[PDB]
Each structure stands twice: as structure tokens, then as C-alpha cells.
């Protein structure tokens, strides 16, 4: 409940700041002031059109590696077992498989872009 109280307090402070920023100042909003910013000239197309991601493969591989991040976090408690031999073998197996995956993607020109 302490964490809930702290989160509420921080969020309430931020929201109060937003309210004070949108209500204390004076405003003269007109169309040209609220128009999109394109370094002085007007935008050609929208900013909601597709924006090609030249690093898509790296992103999917990032998901797959975050899985390994999840799998490796229990290691601090794992070192507390009595079968330290099997624990060490499996931890090094997982880390070597992650290394192998990285090496494969790298050598196959997967970490490169475009």
C-alpha cells in the first residue's frame, strides 16, 4: 500500500503541475500558432504515414533476447542450490546459446540495417 500511496502522490503532483501550466498562463490560441512545425514552411504530407523501420530484424531479435534476459534473472538464487554443477552447466548452456544466436544473426548480416 506504501507503493500505491507513493505512486498516487507522484501522479497527483504531475497532474497538478499540468493543470497549473494549462490554467495559470494566458492564452491567445489561433490556427497558425497551433499548426504543425516543419521548420517554418508547411508540411507536405502527414506525420501518420508509414515510417520505414530499417532495423526491424534487430527489434524482433530484441524481443527474443529479452526472453533470455528473463530466463537469466533467476541465476542469483540458482547459485544457492546443492547441484551447482548442473546449475552452472545449464546457465552456461543458455548463455552460449544466446551467444550463438547473436553470432548467427551477425554473420548472416542480420544486425546490419536496411
Amino acid at each position: 500500500m506504501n507503493i500505491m500511496l507513493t505512486l498516487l502522490t507522484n501522479v497527483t503532483l504531475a497532474s497538478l503541475l499540468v493543470l497549473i501550466a494549462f490554467w495559470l498562463p494566458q492564452l491567445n490560441a489561433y490556427s497558425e500558432k497551433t499548426s504543425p512545425y516543419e521548420c517554418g514552411f508547411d508540411p507536405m504530407g502527414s506525420a501518420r504515414l508509414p515510417f520505414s523501420m530499417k532495423f526491424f530484424l534487430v527489434a524482433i531479435t530484441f524481443l527474443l533476447f529479452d526472453l533470455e534476459i528473463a530466463l537469466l534473472l533467476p541465476l542469483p538464487w540458482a547459485s544457492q542450490t546443492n547441484n551447482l554443477k548442473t546449475m552452472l552447466t545449464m546457465a552456461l548452456f543458455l548463455l552460449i546459446l544466446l551467444a550463438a544466436s547473436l553470432a548467427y544473426e551477425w554473420t548472416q548480416k542480420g544486425l546490419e540495417w536496411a
Binding site: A70, L97, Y104
Partner: protein, 175 residues
């Protein structure tokens, strides 16, 4: 009110699911998924699963990041849709919220609701156990047995992940 933190969080979870399931633009569905992941973390922490909940939140936080980038790249639209931009999305959202509210009030009021299984309205605190785990975090010790007991699960999962990297490379080669 703090007697039923779990129920409130689960209802927020269902609302997030009704949000990302009505299928607004992938951005707001990702917002829903993030909110639901946080609430699920809350529930699991309330039941004593701090590591598991935090892990779900961390993994889905990263996963929805790649989803957001992909959306701005492939699943993009000139006028992205919010839950009040189309009659279909708002219909789905309202129907989902109403269906929740229906079952929520039904089970809270009626002693024993039975939609497809039988549910008892007594607070979750009832089921909790009275034992003591001593100087241990049972979730942590069980999750750490993946390296001492679950060598087979480690083998299978590691192979699956390496083959997943290979599979993504092949599926995106594109000849």
C-alpha cells in the same frame, strides 16, 4: 476498500483487454496491453509473486516497444482510430465494459455466480494459506529450480530461442 484490491485490479485488467480487443489503432491497443500488464503484475504481487509479476511487466514493456515501432512502420494509418472514432470500435468497447459490469455486479451481489464455472463472491483473502515460508521466497526457489531440476526445460527453451532467431532470419529473407 483495500479488502478487495485484487478485484479492482482484475476489473482494470479486463477493461484493458476490452480496450486492446476492440482493436483501436495498434498504438492505443498497445496502451491497453501495457495497462493490463501492469495490473496483472499488481495482482500477482498481491498473491505473493513479485518476481513473476515484475517479469511479466518488464517483458511486455519491451514487447510493446517493438510493436509500437512496427505499427508506425507497417500498421500505420492516416487517421489512427481511437475507441470513439468508429461505431464498431466503440460498440466493441461498450459491449466489453457492459459485459464486465454485468458479471462483476452479478457475482458481487449474488452469493454464487456460475457463468461457465462456479464462482464464489467471498474475497480472495479467504483462499490464502496460513503457513509460513521461513527464510525463503518460494517463487524465487521454484523459479531457480529451472537450472537444477529443469535441465530439460532449459534445453528445449534454449533450442526454441536459437531456432526462433534462425526462423525470423529465414522468414524475413524475402528472396
Amino acid at each position: 476498500m483495500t479488502m478487495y484490491i485484487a478485484f479492482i485490479l482484475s476489473t482494470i485488467f479486463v477493461i484493458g483487454f476490452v480496450g486492446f480487443s476492440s482493436k483501436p489503432s495498434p498504438i492505443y491497443g498497445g496502451l491497453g496491453l501495457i495497462v493490463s500488464g501492469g495490473v496483472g503484475c499488481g495482482i500477482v504481487l498481491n498473491f505473493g509473486g513479485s518476481f513473476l509479476g515484475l517479469m511479466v511487466f518488464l517483458i511486455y514493456l519491451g514487447g510493446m516497444l517493438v510493436v509500437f515501432g512496427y505499427t508506425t512502420a507497417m500498421a500505420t494509418e492516416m487517421y489512427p482510430e481511437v475507441w470513439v472514432s468508429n461505431k464498431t470500435v466503440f460498440g466493441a468497447f461498450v459491449s466489453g465494459l457492459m459485459m464486465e459490469f454485468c458479471m462483476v455486479y452479478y457475482a458481487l451481489k449474488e452469493e454464487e455466480v456460475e457463468i461457465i464455472f462456479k464462482f464464489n463472491g467471498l474475497g480472495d483473502w479467504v483462499i490464502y494459506d496460513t503457513g509460513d515460508s521461513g527464510f525463503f521466497s518460494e517463487e524465487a526457489m521454484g523459479i531457480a529450480a529451472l537450472y537444477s531440476y529443469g535441465t530439460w526445460l532449459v534445453i528445449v527453451t534454449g533450442w526454441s530461442l536459437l531456432i526462433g532467431v534462425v526462423v525470423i532470419m529465414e522468414i524475413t529473407r524475402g528472396n
